[PDB]
Amino acid sequence: KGGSQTLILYGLAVAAVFLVLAALYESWSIPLAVILVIPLGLIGAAAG
Amino acid sequence: AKVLRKTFRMMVVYIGLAVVGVFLFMRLPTSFLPTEDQGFVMVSVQLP
Amino acid sequence: FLALTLTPALCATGFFGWFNKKFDSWTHGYEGRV
Amino acid sequence: AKFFIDRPIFAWVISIFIIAAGIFGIKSLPVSQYPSVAAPTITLHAI
């Protein structure tokens, strides 16, 4: 049943990635240019 | 270079890929671990 | 920690004047008393 | 430092990390004030 705890997983996931991205790259455009790429791998895994 | 000439249309096909991704994902069945081949099989016997 | 980390954001980010003058008077008087 | 002045966003990330860890802390911590102030004591009774 522990499968509907997922939006907190990806909630923490994209938040951690967005932050570290905004930390290294020192802006907010680049993290948005990357978290935009996360569904591209999702369609690949789902179609697989 | 080609996909950059047509930025808008490529952002459209992107959104299409994303939508298809989320739909293809949520159409998948859900389980814990896949029931896999252990060394044995368990048969139980119940008598009236 | 903010003093090293976030408080840098301080640097990154009429009748009121009546009080300023009155305050300026108070510190001048403070100077004299000290 | 001065480098934290020039790039507010790295400080914003460290901050957000901290306020998030704090809010999560608030969510998980026991509510009341009274802790185990007194020493542990164990009684035993019969009838």
Tokens of C14: 């009429």
DSSP, collapsed to helix, strand or coil, labels residue B7 as helix
Q: Identity (one letter) of the amino acid at D38?
A: A
Experimental method: X-ray
Chains touching chain D, criterion 3+ CB pairs below 8 Å:
A, C
Tokens of B29: 């069945």
Tokens of B26: 């949520």
Tokens of C30: 């403070």
Contacts of C13 (CB under 8 A, 6+ apart): D8
Q: d(Cα D34, Cα D27) in Å, to the nearest integer?
A: 18
Of the candidates B8, A44, A19, which has an alpha carbon nearest to the alpha carbon of residue D20? A19
Whether C13 has its CB under 8 Å from any CB of chain D: the answer is yes
Resolution in A: 3.5
Report chain D residues whose CB lies below 8 A from the CB of A26: 7, 9-10
Angle at Cα A46 formed by Cα A36 and Cα A41, nearest 5°?
30
Whether D9 has its CB under 8 Å from any CB of chain A: the answer is yes
Helices (H), A1-48: 6-24, 29-34, 38-47
Contact A40 B20 (CB under 8 A): no
What distance separates the 2 farthest-apart alpha carbons in chain C? 39
Burial class (CB in 10 A: 0-12, 13-18, 19+), B24: middle
Q: d(Cα D43, Cα B12) in Å, to the nearest integer?
A: 74
